[PDB]
Amino acid sequence: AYTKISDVIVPELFNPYVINTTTQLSAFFQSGIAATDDELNALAKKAGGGSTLNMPYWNDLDGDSQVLNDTDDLVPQKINAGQDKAVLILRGNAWSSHDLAATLSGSDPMQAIGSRVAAYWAREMQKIVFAELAGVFSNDDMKDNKLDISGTADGIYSAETFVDASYKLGDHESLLTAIGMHSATMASAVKQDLIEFVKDSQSGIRFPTYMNKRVIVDDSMPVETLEDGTKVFTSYLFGAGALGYAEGQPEVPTETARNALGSQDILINRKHFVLHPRGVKFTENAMAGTTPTDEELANGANWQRVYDPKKIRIVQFKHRLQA
Amino acid sequence: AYTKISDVIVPELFNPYVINTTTQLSAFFQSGIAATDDELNALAKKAGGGSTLNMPYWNDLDGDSQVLNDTDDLVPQKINAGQDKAVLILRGNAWSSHDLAATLSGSDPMQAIGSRVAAYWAREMQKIVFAELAGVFSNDDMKDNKLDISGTADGIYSAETFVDASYKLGDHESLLTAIGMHSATMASAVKQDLIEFVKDSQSGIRFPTYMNKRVIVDDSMPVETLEDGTKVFTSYLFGAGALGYAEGQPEVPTETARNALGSQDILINRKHFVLHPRGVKFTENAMAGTTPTDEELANGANWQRVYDPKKIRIVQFKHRLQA
Amino acid sequence: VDDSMPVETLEDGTKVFTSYLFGAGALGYAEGQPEVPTETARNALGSQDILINR
């Protein structure tokens, strides 16, 4: 062999580098949470098949608890609805190629292969969360207050419908940071509007900005087809600040093993993580398992929310493109 | 007043004794298991919500044998299906002594007061079990392979219909253990059948028996009324070996406070436990909470089950009383 | 910015809003003080404890 801290397999000095590198290099961030508190590093420790965990709300909400005049004592006290049940998911894989890819990277990938896997799970988190929201939030009648459309024969997504969707939260504002986008939309935008290119975070270069919101480019968007040339796009608007996630940990993070009657070897990772909006609750119906559920089944139907209206915090609008 | 193992509360030496005697005394047992995997304790030890998960599977260690021919290998016995959820419940009540206090208030309660407790406690456990088990079949046909029927005025419950129900465990016979029954039925039995008192320990005493089994006399039963004053008795037959359960523990099982204005001292116990047939997985659907549920709602309706066909294992059969 | 404003409805389409203009500089307030600002107490017959301010 070679140096190969994976093929000489020091599980120490490696795994923390892996996860940290994943956090830093990935984005999001932010947008959503980064390095969530103790609370979730605790409930992330000993657990099991859920449901999930709780996951409090935030505001203690009081301001009733009325005139203390003569005679009550006080009423100790009110709390509102509750739960917010969600999913704990499990993932992992080996590495596709042989030691071919592994040390084809080079000799001593103390930081190389780690960077590799890190970027990989970055993309993972991206896809899972994005498809998750898309699978749930839009389809029900319960969330309707957070969606706008117009989106028949007149509107371009510029400078105005962005205002409406932006203020569909009437109480809260300056809580918009990230913006989800479909490529064609930002094409229309960089045509008409002023979306400019700003090295903004320091250091590093760079990534686009509409207004001082950070924008996030993504490939996957639901795209319909109606008769008469029309195409309707989604492009969620949230940038809530934030969602949340906690790590947990499996056992045996990385295992170096080889084979015999062929020439190969295999690396593996298999990490667990817990991520979801809070936000709506995840019910248990129409799902096999477990755990986790799936990608698809983690989408297709059957979620239920309790707040309701505010402090969700996400919105969507289906807008006609630039015609 | 006394040693007050409750009232000045020595928490050692006690709660373990309460649990131990709690199992030892009341039965069931067996029938059902004792001390299955404590996985649901690693869940009971934090954390979990409703429902419980991950209680598979092992409904046998079978899979015959591995011919072992010449050069060849095996590792067969790879099988799966839907897994399970069930329930996790929490309960408790009080126990009250008085300030004027007709005394004693035991001197050596570490056997005594605990013993009374345990007696009460498991005596409630029976109520839960038989309730839920009576809750399965209520609204469903999916169990219908497991239920014989009669009521055309023929069949006595003895010596025949019991044998047919014996075959109703689909492939497997001679796995039976105990027989659940209503008192009037076994009255007809005693007037006819061979029911034979059987001493257990030598000499220690004793369980009634139908045939080489334990008989369980319980009171609350499904009881119908047709027209014509004639009646229908259900009387489950399982002797499966088994149901299942595991405990976990809260914080602070034992606590002591007294009342000022009133004249009392009060006690509480409150242990958590899991019980359910495996057997159907319990749905969280169209029902209250949360958590745990009820007696009633743990009975009324809306359950769903996955194995299926056999190795469940319970059957009910309905018949007229002797005539 | 504030959430609560009186909002009327005149039939039709009109909506009339309030949105006070003051910024006087100022109003005024003084605290005073009660007795027992914060009291830590618990319960028995259940698992809780309670904090209070008043």
From Swiss-Prot, chain C:
Compartments where located: Virion
Protein name per its UniProtKB record: Major capsid protein
Coiled-coil stretches: none
Origin: domain of life: Viruses
Entry's family note: Belongs to the lambda phage major capsid protein family.
Role this protein plays: Capsid protein self-assembles, with the help of the scaffolding protein gp11, to form an icosahedral capsid with a T=7 symmetry, about 61 nm in diameter. The capsid encapsulates the genomic DNA.
Subunit-level organization: Interacts with the scaffolding protein gp11. Interacts with the decoration protein gp12.
Residue numbers of the full-length protein present here: 218 to 271 of 324
